[PDB]
């Protein structure tokens, strides 16, 4: 039951594109503790229970292009 | 036997259109033909897949899906 950090680096245009890949990590609350999302910097901040690989396909399904992603 | 499904998918820009012909485009040739408009909204889907297997397709794009249809 540790809290992870995963950070991604995700291509987002607007605040659609940020709020669509919040609405697909939220709805893993509690699972999901807190999403940071930011435009200037494209990057999407998951802190959460579940694993990495969990993580980064709920978001490659979203179609939104993942750049990167790691552990922090 | 194909069918011409249609949704409106809320969108706002380029990157929100392009992530939803993405996760359709996974689907080729299955899918044979999207058509997306952004002025209007609209995604059209031509496909031998059920309705229901497309609409959740969009709907883990995490886009706002209004209505969809079969023409
Ligand atoms: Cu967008």
């Given at each position: 039951?540790?809290?992870?950090?995963?950070?991604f680096?995700?291509?987002?245009?607007?605040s659609?594109?940020?709020?669509?890949?919040?609405?697909?990590?939220?709805?893993?609350?509690?699972?999901?503790?807190?999403?940071?999302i930011?435009?200037?910097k494209?990057?999407?901040?998951?802190?959460?229970?579940?694993?990495?690989?969990?993580?980064?396909?709920?978001?490659?399904?979203?179609?939104?292009?993942?750049?990167?992603?790691?552990?922090?």
């Open positions: 039951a540790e809290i992870k950090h995963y950070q680096n995700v291509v987002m245009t607007c659609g594109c940020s709020g669509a890949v919040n609405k697909v990590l939220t709805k893993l609350e509690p699972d999901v503790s807190k999403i940071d930011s435009l200037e494209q990057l999407v901040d998951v802190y959460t229970t579940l694993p990495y690989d969990f993580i980064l396909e709920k978001i490659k399904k979203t179609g939104k292009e993942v750049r990167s992603g790691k552990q922090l």
